[PDB]
Amino acid sequence: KPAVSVLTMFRYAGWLDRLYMLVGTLAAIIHGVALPLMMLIFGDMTDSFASVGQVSKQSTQMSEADKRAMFAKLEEEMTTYAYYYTGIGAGVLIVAYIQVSFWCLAAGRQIHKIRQKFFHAIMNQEIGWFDVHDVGELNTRLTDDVSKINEGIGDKIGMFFQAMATFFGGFIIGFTRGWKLTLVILAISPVLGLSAGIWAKILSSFTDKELHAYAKAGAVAEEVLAAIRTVIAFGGQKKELERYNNNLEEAKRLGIKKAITANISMGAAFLLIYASYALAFWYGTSLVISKEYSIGQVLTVFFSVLIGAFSVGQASPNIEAFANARGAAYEVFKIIDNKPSIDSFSKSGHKPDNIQGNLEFKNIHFSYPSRKEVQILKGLNLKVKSGQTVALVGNSGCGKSTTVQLMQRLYDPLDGMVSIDGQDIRTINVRYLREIIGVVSQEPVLFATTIAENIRYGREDVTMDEIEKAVKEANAYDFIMKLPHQFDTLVGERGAQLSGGQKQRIAIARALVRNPKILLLDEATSALDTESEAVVQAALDKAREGRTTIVIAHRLSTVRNADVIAGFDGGVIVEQGNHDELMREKGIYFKLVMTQTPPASFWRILKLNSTEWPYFVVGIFCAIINGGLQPAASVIFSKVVGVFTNGGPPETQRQNSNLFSLLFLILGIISFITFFLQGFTFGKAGEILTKRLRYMVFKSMLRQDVSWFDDPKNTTGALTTRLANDAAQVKGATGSRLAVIFQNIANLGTGIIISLIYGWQLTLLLLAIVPIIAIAGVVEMKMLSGQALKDKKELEGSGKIATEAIENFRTVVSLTREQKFETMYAQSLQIPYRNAMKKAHVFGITFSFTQAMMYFSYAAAFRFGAYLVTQQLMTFENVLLVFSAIVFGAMAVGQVSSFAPDYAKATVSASHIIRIIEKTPEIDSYSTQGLKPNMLEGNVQFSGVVFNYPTRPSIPVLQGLSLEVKKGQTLALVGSSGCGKSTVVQLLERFYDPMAGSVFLDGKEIKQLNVQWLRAQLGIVSQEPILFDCSIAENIAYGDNSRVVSYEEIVRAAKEANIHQFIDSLPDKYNTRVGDKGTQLSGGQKQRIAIARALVRQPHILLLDEATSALDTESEKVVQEALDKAREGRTCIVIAHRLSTIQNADLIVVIQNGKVKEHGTHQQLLAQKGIYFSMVSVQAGA
Ligand SMILES: Brc1ccc(Oc2c(Br)cc(Br)cc2Br)c(Br)c1
């Protein structure tokens, strides 16, 4: 919404840049004017053949006489015109170079200036300016927005004035050579803009419907794939498939309805568009039979107007490119023009010599850019004498740290003054102020250069002698010399990550080369290892006694030798003096001392599409007809101008022109009929395999075991995304692109035959010319992508040192040396700048070449069409036909290159969708194999079970585990922590087979047992019961599948689970909808319902996995009251974390490190004293 003045945007254009744009926009207009003139001469050549075409047929008496005056007219005329086109092609060769080159030159020259000015402005901003913005957005603003500015001021402007030249020059020749047809062509323009407007309404409305249509099926898939361990547990894998299949049926029916309406839309759209043209051209014929215009002029105005009319649409993108470049330049120039109060690049203020270093703070009130929300200093008074070292202590707020911020004049105070020596700090130069102040901060930062270079960021003029003394005087010498490469080592976020105390001494040595008169040490010893602390602390004490120093730290070890100590309380200075005095004061300081002591040939996807042997053959056959039907309009247009250039006697002409125009409209309605079919046939054929694919995928997905859905590569969202994209992409490959690619090869094929059999030696010429300009048009775009990628590679090296500069900013400004990054960024941009200059000559040559190879090509189309061919017996009416036929047949092949990525994007999406079906699990629930035992009673053997989760085969959970529980008993299971309690339930449910050992139930190994039958006698109840969006009657009936459960049977379960209090209380009762879609209710109810569906199954084994996990107060007392009633009649395994409710259990088992450690009844394990009795006495007292 915000934008920029048009002159301010080019503020960096001066002298030559202003000329480049003037000469560029001049030749751009000349380039645009050239095309409607190119068509103007196309009318005069018709009149040349027309005068001869009328007189040649008018004879029917003399033949040799027509070999004289006729050919004489032709050679003087045709050579005059052919001489003119060759001049036009030489003209466009020059102006197209001038157009693109100069604008890209002015762009590159300015964008170099933008960059430098804009990075200059970033470094000039005071700190308070950064505290209110994000530096990451700013850096992306540096590389992206400057690119948008370059796109707007570039060669797009020349293309704009080129298009307006074609537009103006278009209707000028349109108006002057005839004012009627133009008003007639503009009269049909609202109809064309109205038919395309029906598309903006149908698309935007129907694209939402399908995104709502599958959103109903994708919603089913998401609550399933999220609740997968529950559907696997109860074996609803046939229902959840069935229910996803039922939504696919509706999405198919909505997809075929969209296919019907959208194809009616296209066909009716074109048929209105092509009828609009034909009426404007038929009523061009109605004006020639009346002797107002010539057959050549009708062509001249008919093309020049449509060229200029379409030139409007070809200029619209360049308008938006210029407008976005303006809007992008607002926030950029806003930074450049913004002037700070502090600068730090300003050459102003005093520069005192012989600085003794007497500092005082007077009545300083201050607040960080959070402003009126918080005021961190409520007045202040503090002096520090020259040579002394004051220490600042404080409990919180870190107002200690604020004084270091103010001393560097990072911010100015609200009220008060900070005074170095006697002068106010605001009188001294900002840069010289920071050169007389050395800073060592908590987190040391080192730039991505050598050790010497980081030390060289203290002062630019320095020799390895002074680096050596600095690191040796900050005892960091002995510790780099052992490190290889000497001073020439590397440091940064990338490579040679060092010790913190090691990085701090390099910072101290960096601050030591600064030979400052003032020293600020903030938290430097804090957040650092204890032993290297003393090593750095020796350097700090050696960094002083030649300087006055303010130090802030939470280490009360460094503070004793400070000449004076100062404490803060609420921004107010309170205590000050020597250590002994503050201890006698017994205040804040004393109080803190005591406290701290694969693209491949995939045919099978089409073999699955072979389910419909018809529907393609209908569409293919119907597409090839539409392909062969499409040049016939060019054949008609050829003969409409042909027989009426080849007229002769004029009485018969008016009667044939009506016959052809009638044929055209019968030929368009039969084109509507054949294109309503080819779209419907593939549309239906695509929507039906969309179901088959999504059906078979969602079927195969429910087939893998829990080992596959635990994969971090496979989550619920990534699976629904993989489910939706892969099915829609393969639909597009077999969809419109294939009908169109066969329509177009039939378009050119039926066009090449007519042209080849109409023009001898002629078609063979064009087939030598057209492929060259097409390949020359492709090699340009490859060179375009190469130059684009290369410039991206070498400007990110500039933005990389700009990234280091701006998000490490508060350190560099503390070290000054902004001019250093200022220059480094300039040297980095000098390569893309001198590269951007070559870009202009490259784009200019390539563009001018492809334009000349088009004009020169069409000079050879006529010079050969006339002369050698027309001195022979071949005719003009066919030359016009071969042009339209070949040129449209080629431009229809241009759609093949546009649909190319739709194939690769689908094959890659197909690549995954064939793999996802064929992948088979280790534990397949679909296998009908298995024993299906007949005996009822239930035991459970775990014997020497060692288990590791397939996702994390590092720390074992089960190793040598052994259990046994009799029928009708409750097996309590206690653990120190982890899923060692829960993995038992997962292995009995056979979510996994164990690595070693085995688990049995009725004496039979479950590994050889039926997987589905096994899970059918299991009453799993988890800690967060997931309930699908449906009637609670079904959420309860979900516990028994392969059969519909009675109402009074799901009532009995609701009676058991003690949930029946709601189930009558609701207005809907058992038919209420739950799932946070129709109704919401708390967890205790969700849980009871899970108990209800658990014992609908009438299991012989309950599995209670921390059922009272998320639950509170009386809700625990009633759910336990339901669980305690559910067991005791069944085999039970309960791992609930309430050991008070576990006391009444037939056998309690303590799990240690995967091994069974301690088992027995409650009082038996309570008589023993160990883990269980520690587990029961850790929560009874707490
Ligand atoms: Br119908 C018909 C279509 C294209 C024809 O030649 C061209 C060609 Br070839 C290129 C361009 Br741009 C414009 C025209 Br008009 C002719 Br002549 C007749």
Author numbering: 30 to 626, 689 to 1273
Give verbatim lines from the article.
The multidrug transporter P-glycoprotein (Pgp)/ABCB1/MDR1 plays an important role in multidrug resistance (MDR) and detoxification owing to its ability to efflux an unusually large and chemically diverse set of substrates. P-glycoprotein (Pgp), a member of the ATP-binding cassette (ABC) superfamily, is one of the most promiscuous drug transporters in nature and is capable of binding and expelling a very large number of substrates from the cell. The structures highlight a high concentration of aromatic residues in the transmembrane α-helices that form the DBP, many of which are directly engaged in contacts with ligands. The binding mode of the environmental pollutant BDE-100 in the DBP of Pgp was also previously captured by XRC and it was shown to be a potent inhibitor of verapamil-stimulated ATPase activity of the transporter.
Surprisingly, the F724A mutant structure had no detectable binding in site 1 but exhibited a novel site shifted 11 Å from site 1. A close inspection shows that the Phe979 side chain in the other structures appears to be just outside van der Waals contact distance with the ligand (not shown), and therefore it does not appear to contribute much to the binding energy. Surprisingly, the F724A mutant exhibited no detectable BDE-100 occupancy in site 1, but revealed a novel site 3 that was shifted ∼11 Å from site 1 and was located directly on the axis of pseudosymmetry of the DBP formed by residues Met68, Phe71, Phe332, Phe728, Tyr949, Phe974 and Val978 [Fig. 1(c)]. The F724A mutation resulted in a greater shift of binding of a single ligand molecule in site 3 that lies directly on the pseudosymmetric axis of the transporter. Site 3 overlaps in 3D space with sites 1A and site 2 in the other structures, and there does not appear to be sufficient space to accommodate more than one ligand in the F724A structure. The novel site 3 binding site in the F724A mutant refined to a considerably lower occupancy of ∼0.4 compared with the occupancy of site 1 in the C952A control, Y303A, Y306A and F979A mutants. Phe724 and Phe728 (both on TM7) appear to be important for maintaining the integrity of the canonical BDE-100 site 1, since the mutation of either residue resulted in ligand shifts away from this site. We conclude that Phe974 undergoes an induced fit-like disorder-to-order transition to support the binding of BDE-100 in sites 2 and 3, and this residue is therefore important for polyspecific recognition of the BDE-100 ligand when the primary binding site (site 1) is challenged by mutagenesis. All structures were determined in the 3.98–4.17 Å resolution range and adopted the same inward-facing conformation as wild-type Pgp.
